[PDB]
Design a protein around this ligand. Structure first.
Ligand SMILES: Nc1nc2c(c(=O)[nH]1)N=C(CNc1ccc(S(=O)(=O)Nc3nccs3)cc1)CN2
Ligand SMILES: Nc1nc2c(c(=O)[nH]1)N=C(CNc1ccc(S(=O)(=O)Nc3nccs3)cc1)CN2
Lengths: 267, 267
């Protein structure tokens, strides 16, 4: 179906063979204890079937505390250098800032993961263009007053493509994400899942990030630690509705579900 | 969507509100220890969200040892009487025999579950007609030489409807089952899952039975006890492709997945 592979640097990721698992790595206090914990977690997630490792923090997570520019660098960079050498998998850096994104690739990160899809700092997309690296553009907005959810999401996403393409970003580096849990009531979150196949008309791979999110909590009436089964249902629907990547905490469980989905749907 | 509820005796099961969980109860050695274990398991499965309890044995499970007529009765009947009184849920009896099926309802069973869809003993469908009780007709055959899997399954299933309807069985008591793991290579099992939505044109509710089955094992390369995630993927696809009931061992986990699927698909 996809006439190209996802080329990054040392590793080639094939989009037709299977659903790609992206394992989540949270980094919230460069001491030994934090960098070692992060490495051990990545090894674990590698051993359980992760294809990409995702490295972010306290900005970009509810709270959304606007922590400092130089601060993000000294936290995330040692993390990348260590994971890159010990763990033979591509890495994405979860940031909405060009400045940070910049260091991250130079320290060895491969994919950019922007929860603001270049609207925070359009300069990020120039960084993307220049090192020639896949960039994930997530739907997000600073309000959530939709005329029409899906139509507005596709419009918003397209506003992101436009920023990337104009920067020089080649199509084959774009990847989109419906931004589950961002600027969306819990009902809107469900609608987006129900209509996920609409993002496919845009012609770019899609990544889904629903792991343990609160709309799962809203439905099941369950706290974060009991959300594994409900995360599973969201990963299955997503694969069936055409997603290429899933971002998850529970690499082991999700990896089995994805591999059974792939076999059933014919991937 | 369904203009009727599933009427049985004391309990009414609604087909539009949610996916119905049918919990599996295996009974393979009327001593106290077996009947007490069976009751405790049913209470557990009730507490975890089961809507129906399913009571069968060594016939109807690989092995398929052709154990005795009077033998099935004295094993399964005490089981039903006890579960019926302690546990306020409808019960199905997993048998392919009229004789047995007969006792089962009289002892308090509500639904008939025939893995041979009335082709073993067409007389079973007369039992169904007479007590006015939902009957599940599963696809099965004594060979597995398909001209065309789905077309043959729909033809075979229709051969079962014909036997039931002629007996007097009202449409609103029929329920069909694609018979996953029966007379089907593991690849055929996957195809059937991939095309499950085709059974819907027949106009009857569908029940899916894929729990921990070996085609899940074939894909994941995993023994029976590590098949929970892969069972989950099959339950999710099934719900999305329109099934009304799922037959499962892990009532807790599946129940959460089904409830998250229901919310996403709009059920
Ligand atoms: N590509 C991509 N990257 C991501 C994504 C994502 O979905 N896609 N999500 C987060 C995590 N942010 C997040 C976590 C939980 C929720 S929530 O729905 O559960 N809401 C709340 N969580 C805690 C308090 S309120 C919302 C956003 C970080 N990076
Ligand atoms: N309505 C309905 N009723 C049922 C069903 C069913 O699917 N639907 N399945 C069984 C269980 N039979 C079964 C269990 C496992 C497999 S298998 O695919 O895993 N094969 C084998 N299992 C063990 C050795 S070979 C096949 C059939 C009993 N009753």
């Amino acid at each position: 179906k996809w006439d190209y592979d996802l080329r990054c640097g040392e590793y080639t990721l094939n989009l037709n063979e299977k659903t790609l698992i992206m394992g989540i790595l949270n980094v919230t206090p460069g001491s030994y204890n934090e960098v070692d914990a992060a490495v051990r977690h990545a090894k674990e997630m590698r051993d359980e079937g992760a294809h990409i490792i995702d490295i972010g923090g306290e900005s970009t997570r509810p709270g959304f505390a606007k922590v400092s520019v130089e601060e993000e660098i000294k936290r995330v960079v040692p993390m990348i250098q260590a994971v890159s050498k010990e763990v033979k998998l591509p890495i994405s850096i979860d940031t909405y800032k060009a400045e940070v994104a910049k260091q991250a690739i130079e320290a060895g990160a491969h994919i950019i993961n922007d929860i603001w899809g270049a609207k925070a700092e359009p300069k990020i997309a120039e960084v993307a263009a220049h090192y020639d690296v896949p960039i994930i553009l997530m739907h997000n907005r600073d309000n959530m007053n939709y005329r029409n959810l899906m139509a507005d999401m596709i419009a918003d996403l397209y506003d992101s493509i436009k920023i990337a393409k104009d920067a020089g970003v080649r199509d084959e580096n774009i990847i989109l994400d419906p931004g589950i849990g961002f600027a969306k009531t819990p009902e809107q979150n469900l609608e987006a899942m129900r209509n996920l196949e609409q993002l496919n008309v845009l012609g770019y791979p899609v990544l889904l990030g629903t792991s343990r999110k609160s709309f799962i909590g809203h439905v099941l009436d369950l706290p974060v630690e009991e959300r594994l089964e409900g995360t599973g249902a969201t990963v299955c629907l997503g694969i069936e509705k055409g997603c290429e990547f899933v971002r998850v905490h529970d690499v082991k469980e999700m990896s089995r579900m994805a591999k059974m989905m792939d076999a059933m749907i014919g991937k």
